[PDB]
Amino acid sequence: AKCEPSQFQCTNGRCITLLWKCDGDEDCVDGSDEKNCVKKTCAESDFVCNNGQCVPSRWKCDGDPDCEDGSDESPEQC
Amino acid sequence: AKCEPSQFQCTNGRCITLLWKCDGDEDCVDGSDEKNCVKKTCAESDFVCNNGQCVPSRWKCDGDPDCEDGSDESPEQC
Amino acid sequence: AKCEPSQFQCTNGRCITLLWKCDGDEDCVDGSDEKNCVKKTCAESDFVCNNGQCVPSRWKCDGDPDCEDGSDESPEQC
Amino acid sequence: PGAFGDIQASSLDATDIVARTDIRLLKPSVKNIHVPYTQAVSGYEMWK
Amino acid sequence: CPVPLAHTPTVTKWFKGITLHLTATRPTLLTTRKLGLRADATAEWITGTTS
Amino acid sequence: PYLGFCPYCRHSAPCFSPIKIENVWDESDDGSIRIQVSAQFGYDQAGTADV
Amino acid sequence: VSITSGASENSCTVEKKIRRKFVGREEYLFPPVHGKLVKCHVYDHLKETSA
Amino acid sequence: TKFRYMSYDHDHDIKEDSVKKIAISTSGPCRRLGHKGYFLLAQCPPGDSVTVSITSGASENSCTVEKKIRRKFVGREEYLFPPVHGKLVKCHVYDHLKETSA
Amino acid sequence: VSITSGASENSCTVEKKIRRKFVGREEYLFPPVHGKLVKCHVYDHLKETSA
Ligand SMILES: [Ca+2]
Ligand SMILES: [Ca+2]
Ligand SMILES: [Ca+2]
Ligand SMILES: [Ca+2]
Ligand SMILES: [Ca+2]
Ligand SMILES: [Ca+2]
């Protein structure tokens, strides 16, 4: 039957939700996010937040945070 | 006689909606806008927009529109 | 007693309103505002409005009214 | 009051208007000068 | 707190009964009961005009 | 112009205001409304007219 | 009705049943692009007019 | 004048911001009647949810909670605006004076 | 949808029954944290995808 996440079984026999497959929070002792999944840090003109989310080049300080961590609007750089 | 629009049967025999008459576009072939409505020709207490629309001159740049075409926020100064 | 304002009786024997007990606008000659409520004035770090209800001068003129009478945003004060 | 035609006149411009909208007024309990009035919602509105 | 007073209801009277001409724009909870052995109380969220 | 007592304004509790609603009409089929208000519009302190 | 400037940031409002209004016998949120024109009444914008 | 919260920053320290940058809403914006400690007191129009929010650069996140904040009224008539004239009846209101203890 | 820039400040609108909907079998105002991860469909915010 479907596992509790209705998704893939990891190496220890647990199964994990794809919502966690590439979150960088390795849900299992071996596998999960440890298995290759794509991340690319955008163009060199753009800024990047604590969790690795990019923001557009013209929004590095503008009053509206385009990263949900707020990094593109912190008094540490604005 | 009154007809389709309940407006005016114009000189060329066309039932034209008077809702368009006072618009600056000759709806009928002859007449219509030729029976020119009150273009007031406002004094310089008002600015004049691209439509020739008069609006209070202190609003020529303020961040909020006053004319239908918005010329009262035109990049010609604002 | 519990008559016109269901509240108190003044020294003239009249029904008088505890809602109208503490407010600049005073009432019956005694059995009224004279035993004042907490009308204590704040410290000198607080701006004082025309009603005498103080509010922090850290605010005062800031584009957002802080007194009941609105005194904190007056061009007579800003 | 509250029926159709609760206000009437022979014409809108005439000054001989007559009506019976059950207008009644109460005591001004609050300090602030007032004239508390209670009446039927306009009978013209109910008929509409 | 202030609460409104709905317009006093014109009362029409007849043999062993009353008709209340209620006139209130907002929902108003009318209630009534007899003073006999049985209260027979009633309640209705009257709206607008009604009899 | 002039002032009046509104059932409610900036700080809820009924208070006096230089801007007060006297009547409201909504008979327009387009649903627009025409407001009578205690302030005066289009006139200066001197009473001269100005939009 | 509310001003938002300087000390005069005051407001004011009364209870008006400004329900959605329409003309004709077809409900609409906005007048449609077209299809029919019917006699209706609106408050005109020409402030020179007197009601 | 100010409020304090634990920052997302990884050194885990308390950061401050001015209270005029807080807002509360349910449908339209509420009025922040008073605040004290980790409690905000506000008057809000009826709605199906409550929302608290900040409007301060990086600190512009917000939180909402499902709550049936339906309109209610003292007395016996579903009045929308508090009546200017009428009977005064016993009602319970949260005392805006933050010293009061609930 | 509106361009609030002020430079060409304008807006457009159309009628649409944009009514809140909910996958599953219980009404909710917001996705509650705990419960079955039932199958559902949502638009991938990755603008490089194609419908
Ligand atoms: Ca994971
Ligand atoms: Ca930004
Ligand atoms: Ca024309
Ligand atoms: Ca303008
Ligand atoms: Ca007093
Ligand atoms: Ca202020």
C-alpha separations of F12 from C40, C68, F30, H81 in Å: 24, 10, 30, 9
Closest CA to H47 of H32, H22, H64: H64
Q: Which residues, at least 6 apart from B59, have a Cβ–Cβ distance to it below 8 Å?
A: B47, B66, B72
Gap between the Cα atoms of F13 and E29, Å rounded: 25
In chain H, whose CA is at the least distance from the CA of D36? H85
Beta strands in H13-96 (DSSP E): 14-18, 22-25, 31-36, 39-43, 47-54, 62-69, 87-88
Name the percent of chain A in helix, strand, coil, to the closest 5. 10, 10, 80
Alpha helices in chain A (DSSP H): none
Rounded CA separation H33/A30 (Å)? 53
**Secondary structure (3-state) at G43:** coil
Please give the structure tokens belonging to residue C47. Answer: 């701006």
Give the span between the Cα atoms of C78 and G7, in whole angstroms: 10
| Amino acid letter for position B14 | R
**What residues contact G49, with CB distance under 8 A and at least 6 apart?**
none
B73 SS3 class: helix
B35 vs I9: CA distance, rounded Å:
33
Taking contacts as CB-CB distances below 8 angstroms, the residues of chain B near G39 are 6
Asked if residues F34 and G16 have their Cβ atoms less than 8 Å apart, the reply is no
3-state DSSP assignment of residue I42:
coil
- Residue among H66, H68, H64, H87 nearest H77 (CA): H87
DSSP strand E in E1-51: where? 2-3, 10-14, 17-32, 42-50
Q: Residue G23 and residue H66: Cα distance in Å, rounded?
A: 38
Scan residues 4-43 of D and list those with Cβ closer than 8 Å to E.
22, 24, 26, 36, 38-41
- The first and second tokens of residue C73, run together, are 């945003």
Nearest alpha-carbon partner for H96 in H15, H46, H24, H41: H41
Q: Which residue has the tokens 């939700």?
A: A17
Instruction: Tell me if G14 sits within 8 A of F3, measured CB to CB.
Output: no
E strand or H helix at B46, and its extent?
Answer: strand B46-48
> Could you tell me which of D9, D6, G18 has the C-alpha nearest to residue E23?
D6
CA distance B43 to C35: 63
Q: At F4, is the secondary structure helix, strand, or coil?
A: strand
Phi, psi of H22 (to 5 degrees): -85, 150
Q: Give C70's contacts in chain F (Cβ within 8 Å).
A: 10
Within 8 A of G7 by CB-CB distance, chain C residues are 65, 69-77
Residues 6+ apart with CB under 8 A from E36: none
Q: Which residues of G touch C75 (CB under 8 A)?
A: 6-7
Q: Which two tokens stand for residue A61?
A: 């300080």
Beta strands in chain C (DSSP E): 8-9, 15-16, 46-47, 55-56
Instruction: Please give the residue of chain G at the shortest CA–CA distance from B19.
Output: G37
Handedness of CA G24, G29, G35, G38 (dihedral sign): positive
Neighbours of C72 (CB within 10 A): 23
CA A69 – ligand 2 centroid, Å: 11
- Rounded Cα distance between I1 and C66, Å, is 34
As a whole number of angstroms, the distance between CA E37 and CA A68 comes to: 69
CA of B18 to the centre of ligand 3 (A): 8
Q: Distance from the CA of B73 to the center of ligand 4, in angstroms?
A: 5
| Residue G11 touches chain H, beta carbons under 8 Å | no
H96 Cβ neighbours under 8 A, 6+ residues apart: H33, H34, H41
**DSSP character at residue D40:** P
Structure tokens at B67: 């004319």
Cα–Cα distance, H2 to H15 (Å, whole number): 10
Ligand 2 centroid to Cα of residue E15, in Å, is 78
- Cα H69 to Cα H80: distance, rounded to the nearest angstrom: 15
Q: How far apart are CA C73 and CA C50, in angstroms?
A: 12
- Experimental approach was cryo-EM
Q: CB distance H84–D28 less than 8 Å?
A: no
Interchain proximity G16–F31, CB inside 8 Å: no
Hey, what are H22's tokens? 């807080």
Tokens representing B58 are 């202190």
Nearest CA to I26 out of I17, I11, I36 is that of I36
- Return the number of other C-beta atoms located less than 10 Å from residue H29's C-beta: 14
d(CA A11, CA A29): 8
Q: Is G16 helix (H, G, I), strand (E, B) or coil?
A: coil
* G14 and chain H in contact, CB less than 8 A: yes
For E11, the token pair is 């009362």
Cα–Cα distance measured from residue B70 to residue B55, given in angstroms and rounded to the nearest whole number? 10
Partners of E23 on chain D (C-beta within 8 Å) are: 1-2, 22, 39-41
Q: Which helix (H) or strand (E) holds D47?
A: helix D43-47
Residue B24 gets the label, from left (phi > 0), alpha (psi -120 to 50) or beta, of left
Residue I26 touches partner G, C-beta closer than 8 Å: no
F16 Cβ under 8 Å from any chain D Cβ = yes
Residue type for H80, please?
L
| C-alpha to C-alpha distance for B36 and B25, rounded to whole angstroms | 11
Q: B72 CA to middle of ligand 4, Å? A: 4
**Could you give the C-alpha distances from C47 to C37, C69, C72, D10, in angstroms and in order?**
21, 13, 7, 62
Euclidean distance between CA atoms C18 and D46, whole angstroms = 41
Integer Cα distance of A56 and A66 in angstroms: 8
User: 3-state DSSP call for residue B34?
Assistant: helix
Contact, C70 vs G10, CB < 8 A?
Answer: yes
Contact G2, G14 (CB under 8 A): no
* Resolution to 1 decimal place, in Å: 4.0
Distances (CA, A) of H62 to A70, H53, H59: 12, 4, 9
C38's CB contacts (< 8 A; 6+ apart) are H97
